[PDB]
Design a binder for this molecule. Structure first.
Ligand code: ZN
Lengths: 63, 195, 55, 149, 99, 134, 214
RNA sequence: AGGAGGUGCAUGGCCGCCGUCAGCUCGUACCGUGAGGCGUCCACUUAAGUGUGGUAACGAGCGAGACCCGCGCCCCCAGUUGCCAGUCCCUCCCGCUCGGGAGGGAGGCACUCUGGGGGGACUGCCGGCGAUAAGCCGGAGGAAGGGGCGGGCGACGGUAGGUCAGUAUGCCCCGAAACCCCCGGGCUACACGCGCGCUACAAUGGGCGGGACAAUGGGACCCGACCCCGAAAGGGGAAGGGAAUCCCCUAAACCCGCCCUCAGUUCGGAUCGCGGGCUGCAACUCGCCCGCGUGAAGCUGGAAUCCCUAGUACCCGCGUGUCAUCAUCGCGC
């Protein structure tokens, strides 16, 4: 089973809402800025958040 | 070998701690620290009531040093007594106090609720107290009082929380008291926020 | 009535030459690193002796 | 050409045949009535196993030298059939190895390194290398791929 | 020459002592051989959980890890006095020998 | 030009040194042409045969292998030799041929032993004692 | 015993075992053609690596499949030729070198006795011993029925190889015949369609039961 | 005082099973006179009360996940007690040395290695399905594709499940006995039923000689290289090692050559005789090892029944815990 976590989803949503222009559809850039802008200390969790914010930005640009 | 020295030191600290726990039950014992100095050894004992630890005239401290040196084999020990940083956050001390209250004869429900409220108001994310034994009748029971946030599974529950256990010897038998406290300032991995 | 009796005879080997320093048992004594601790005592003690259960 | 370019068994048998000539290597009087290790069930079936064993010991000293009685015994040990009990590994006897090494020393093929063991002398090294060279020359005809070596 | 062997159950204390020694060597200006990390010693003890014989057998593996570092320096008066003035925390053990 | 490569299989570690020569391939100093058993000899020989006679008779290889068994050491030496040959000639067509034939010659084998567990340990991680049921 | 040339055989081309080439090998059954792998391969030893995947053994060389199937004891919970062959410590399990040698000897015997490609003869035996239909229990409504079903190509190949290996083991069991001789005889008989072969007999048995129950 | 005397139907702590199952609950509101109900339901999805959407419920807690240890790829640092690829010297050997190989010193850390910090793997990308979400199937790249692979962590409770004979402990009892020490015996008995295993019933082999390749761990009345003695067990001296420096430690399965040729046999190794040793204060009850001698069932096993999805199962040996000696055992390699 592979389902995203509650706190991961909430953190991604609040991050994208707070910084609309600081993320794009690039996973590497989202990862860098998530590490920079979050108190996360786990690489796995940071990758989780980065991937989900990339997904959210893709949905936004799609409409 | 080097491991043999590590093991002997750990075992000696063990036996000293157990003996002191037996001796200083009414002194609000919280723990000890043993350090080596060129002259000998120094032992710091954390007690909520250093009055009992020191005694009257220093006879208790003199005899305690005598025993801890001869019986336990420590080399030229000097004993100092210090205050607990916060008795309401040390699980062992709270468990001992609750057991002593039960021995005194306070109703278990009232004592548990009072201790829980005091611990919560003194600053703690969460607390849980479990009382097991012959309560309310001949058939033993096990009742838990809980408040706040707590963790019991995983490395955070193994490390962050402080746990203590004590035995209250009443007239009808032994009551087991277990206390778990989550100290303030402890952050679980699930808690992250923007900086 | 002499005191020569009632005394354990010296023993250098066997199950009667090792006891748990904390329990006084005679059976499963751990001698891996000179612990001289009973199995039950060591189990109840390991977390605070420096030993850990990593995996 | 040297020992490393020749299969071990083909070289050992030839070394045994050649060593049969040297008079300093003779079977002990108790050789016919002895097994080669407590783990063995029945005694050898060769009537000249002494020379094969001595050749094997000499090659071992050449390769892994310096070595000693205990390590050679470890090499020459093996599994034992204990009956209903599970099979287990045991070492070999020491008299055979010690006498073989002493005979080799008398012949001049090995020498004692104090506190370390026994090492092959230049004479024994040349002897083994000559046997290996002859064997490799014989083998090259069958296997052309060994010519370049 | 002086060989120092430093062993502890805490990697952070180990590194603190190593960094202190390195700083002492750097300030004194004496060439220092980097800290050699020797293989960790893992004492493992497997014990039966149950205090009785009933129930399916379950075991717990309690492991104690000891970490070791080695350093080699060239003997000097000020350097060796400063080294002997090391903090040597409680959980760290230091041995000094001359070659 | 001396080139060094490494190969790993289970607990077998092989270090291969390749240079310019006549085609002498030695494993621990013993010629590859007399490797026993034939299974291990074929495992070691396969990359050279794939590469061809011209490249084979143009380089000298010395391989030192430790740990593992007679098959693990052979496979580690195979990996080391394949990598050494590929890096020496710098032929992308040869690398492609090796990848299509066997991806494991250049890429290692991650598989390792799974630690054993109680309930008839010393037999395997999942082997269990027979249950009476009555 | 055997010549030093055979002991130290040194291949120089990429062909099965370094002795036989599969370029001329022909497979007729269109069902089994996509699953009998005949790509160039010197050593039939893949160290597994195909169990993880699904249909991952469809790309393993046929000779490697035969070696793996031969590597066994013969029978532990199923009776072969009305007997059990529980070889505990003398089995070929975990001895791929021994299985490889046995298969090599069997192919040599087959080529000596037939004059054709041993791999081609093995292919013929597989084609002749692969069943085409079976029967199974299928439930419709509230009760079961003994219905007839077809067999997929991979299952056909599996059954053929299994039957050949089992027949070889049964022939060799406690008999003067060696394992290599038993395997060669079984393969040749299966190729020749002689009902004596365990593989052909079992194929015919399954076929007749399936036809009766269809 | 002491009590391994009773009570685990008086207890604490601990542990097995339900069960690594996904469940168990709280604040407020609302329905029912009440026990109680909703949230916790429905469609889809997940290993999961995992998640999306709809709703008289809106939020939350403990579980799951997160977390922690190890394995697999790459980079930085570190170069000893670890390593020896290049270069110099010395010595030796071969086809007489063109050429090739071995060892020791200097020297290096280049590769392996040890151990600290980091990167990498994130449905991140493509196609399809689902509804555009939850997500699922396949594909490229890649060391690692879908919980990366294996483990530690066992919720509210129950199971009057086991433990007072590990320690603690209520009650009851002995209290000069049930308390405390010394010898001797027993727990090792043996018409028989059962569980889990070892050895085998042979050629997918037995014997003989020869040739290869590990890892985990341990070492002070301890491991012991190395030499001498002995046919084996074993005995005497003794370097080194509190350990990346010395040792345990040149494993077996496997490969070659010869004998045996389907036979209760050169299979199988129970059962006794004689003799030689080791540990231990003590070896008969009741220890282990060794040489010779004999050679008991067993020729594949009914009903029934057990474990296992990948370096896993099966085969093959070794380390350690117990230890003065003794491993067909547990835990690991
Ligand atoms: Zn104890």
């Amino acid at each position: 089973g592979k389902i995203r976590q509650g706190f991961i989803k909430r953190v991604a949503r609040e991050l994208v809402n707070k910084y609309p222009n600081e993320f794009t559809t690039d996973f590497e850039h989202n990862k860098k800025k998530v590490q920079e802008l979050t108190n996360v200390t786990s690489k796995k969790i940071r990758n989780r958040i980065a991937g989900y914010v990339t997904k959210l930005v893709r949905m936004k640009m799609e409409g | 070998a080097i491991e043999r020295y590590f093991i002997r030191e750990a075992v000696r600290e063990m036996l000293i701690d157990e003996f002191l726990e037996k001796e200083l039950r009414r002194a609000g014992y919280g723990g000890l620290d043993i350090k080596k100095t060129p002259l000998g050894t120094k032992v710091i004992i954390f007690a909520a009531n250093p009055g009992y630890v020191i005694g009257r005239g220093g006879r208790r401290i003199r005899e305690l040093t005598r025993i801890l040196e001869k019986q336990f084999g420590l080399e030229n020990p000097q004993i100092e007594v210090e205050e607990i940083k916060n008795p309401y956050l040390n699980a062992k001390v709270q468990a001992v106090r609750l057991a002593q209250a039960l021995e005194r004869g306070i109703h278990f429900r009232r004592a548990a609720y009072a201790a829980l409220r005091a611990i919560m108001n003194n600053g703690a994310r969460g607390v849980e107290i479990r009382l097991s034994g012959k309560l309310t009748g001949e058939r033993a029971k096990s009742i838990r009082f809980y408040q706040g946030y707590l963790a019991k599974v995983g490395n955070p529950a193994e490390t962050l929380v402080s746990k203590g256990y004590a035995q209250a010897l009443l007239k009808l038998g032994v009551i087991g008291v277990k206390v778990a406290i989550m100290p303030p300032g402890a952050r679980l991995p699930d808690e992250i926020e923007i900086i | 009535a002499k005191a020569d009796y009632n005394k354990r005879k010296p023993r250098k080997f066997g199950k009667g030459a090792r006891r748990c320093i904390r329990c006084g048992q005679y059976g499963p004594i751990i001698r891996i690193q000179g612990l001289m601790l009973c199995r039950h005592c060591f189990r109840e003690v390991a977390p605070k002796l420096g030993f850990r259960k990593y995996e | 050409a040297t020992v490393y370019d020749v299969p071990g068994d083909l070289l050992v048998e030839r070394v045994a045949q050649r060593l049969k000539e040297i008079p300093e290597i003779k079977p002990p009087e108790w050789a016919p009535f002895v097994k080669t290790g407590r783990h063995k069930e029945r005694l050898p079936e060769q009537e000249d196993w002494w020379y094969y064993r001595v050749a094997s010991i000499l090659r071992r000293v050449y390769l892994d030298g310096p070595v000693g009685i205990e390590r050679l015994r470890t090499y020459y040990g093996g599994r034992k059939n204990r009956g209903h009990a599970p099979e287990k590994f045991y070492k070999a006897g020491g008299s055979i190895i010690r006498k073989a090494l002493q005979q080799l020393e008398a012949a001049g093929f090995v020498e004692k390194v104090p506190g370390k063991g026994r090492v092959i002398t230049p004479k024994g090294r040349s002897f083994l290398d000559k046997i290996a060279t002859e064997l490799k020359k014989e083998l090259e005809e069958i296997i052309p791929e060994l010519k370049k070596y | 020459k002086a060989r120092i062997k430093i062993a502890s159950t805490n990697v952070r204390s180990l590194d603190e002592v190593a960094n202190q020694i390195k700083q002492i060597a750097e300030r004194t200006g004496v060439r220092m051989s980097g800290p050699i990390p020797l293989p960790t010693k893992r004492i493992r003890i497997t014990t039966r959980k149950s205090p009785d014989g009933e129930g399916s057998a379950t075991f717990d593996r309690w492991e104690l890890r000891v970490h070791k570092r080695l350093i080699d320096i060239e003997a000097d008066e000020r350097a060796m006095r400063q080294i002997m003035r090391i903090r040597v925390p409680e959980d760290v053990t230091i041995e000094i020998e001359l070659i | 030009r001396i080139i060094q490569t490494t190969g790993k299989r289970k607990t077998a570690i092989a270090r291969a040194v390749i240079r310019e020569g006549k085609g002498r391939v030695r494993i621990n100093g013993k010629p590859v042409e007399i490797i026993e058993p034939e299974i291990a000899r074929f495992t070691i020989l396969e990359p050279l045969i794939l590469a061809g006679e011209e490249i084979w008779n143009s380089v000298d290889i010395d391989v030192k292998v430790e740990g593992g068994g007679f098959m693990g050491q052979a496979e580690a030496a195979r990996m080391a030799i394949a990598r050494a040959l590929v890096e020496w000639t710098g032929d992308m067509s040869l690398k492609e041929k090796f990848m299509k034939y066997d991806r494991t010659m250049l890429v290692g084998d991650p598989r390792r032993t799974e630690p054993h567990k109680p309930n008839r340990s010393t037999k395997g991680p999942r082997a269990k004692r027979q249950k009476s049921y009555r | 015993a055997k010549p030093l040339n055979e002991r130290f055989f040194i291949p120089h081309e990429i062909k099965v075992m370094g002795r036989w080439s599969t370029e001329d090998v022909e497979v007729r059954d269109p069902s089994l053609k996509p699953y009998i792998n005949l790509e160039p391969r010197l050593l039939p030893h893949t160290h597994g690596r195909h169990a993880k995947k699904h249909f991952g053994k469809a790309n393993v060389h046929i000779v490697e499949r035969l070696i793996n199937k031969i590597m066994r004891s013969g029978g532990s919970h199923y009776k072969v030729a009305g007997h059990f062959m529980r070889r505990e410590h003398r089995s070929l399990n975990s001895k791929k070198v021994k299985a490889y040698e046995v298969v090599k000897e069997a192919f040599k015997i087959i080529e000596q006795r037939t004059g054709k490609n041993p791999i081609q003869v093995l292919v013929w035996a597989i084609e002749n011993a692969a069943p085409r239909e079976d029967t199974t229990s299928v439930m419709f409504g509230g009760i079961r029925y003994h219905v007839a079903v077809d067999i997929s190509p991979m299952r056909r190949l599996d059954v053929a190889l299994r039957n050949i290996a089992l027949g070889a083991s049964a022939k060799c069991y406690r008999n003067k015949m060696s394992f290599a001789e038993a395997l060669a005889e079984e393969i040749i008989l299966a190729a020749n369609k002689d009902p004596k072969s365990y593989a052909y007999s079992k194929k015919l048995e399954i076929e007749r039961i399936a036809e009766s129950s269809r």
